[PDB]
Amino acid sequence: LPAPSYWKNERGSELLIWSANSGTIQGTFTNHAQGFACQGIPYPAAGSVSPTGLYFVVTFAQCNSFTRWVGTIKGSQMPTSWTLFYVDNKGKPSRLKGGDIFTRVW
Closest CA to 27 of 51, 10, 8, 3: 3
Q: In the chain, what are the domains?
A: 1-106 (2.40.128.30)
Give the helix/strand (H/E) hosting 77.
Answer: strand 77-87
Q: Which residues contact 63 (CB under 8 A, 6 or more apart)?
A: 37, 38, 86
CB 71 within 8 A of CB 81: yes
- The technique by which this structure was obtained is X-ray
Adjacent-strand bridge partners of 86: 65, 94
Neighbours of 75 (CB within 10 A): 7
Q: Is 37 annotated as a binding residue?
A: yes
| Annotated binding-site residue? 89 | no
Q: Cα separation of 12 and 20, whole Å?
A: 23
Annotated binding-site residue? 88: no
DSSP letter for 91, please: S
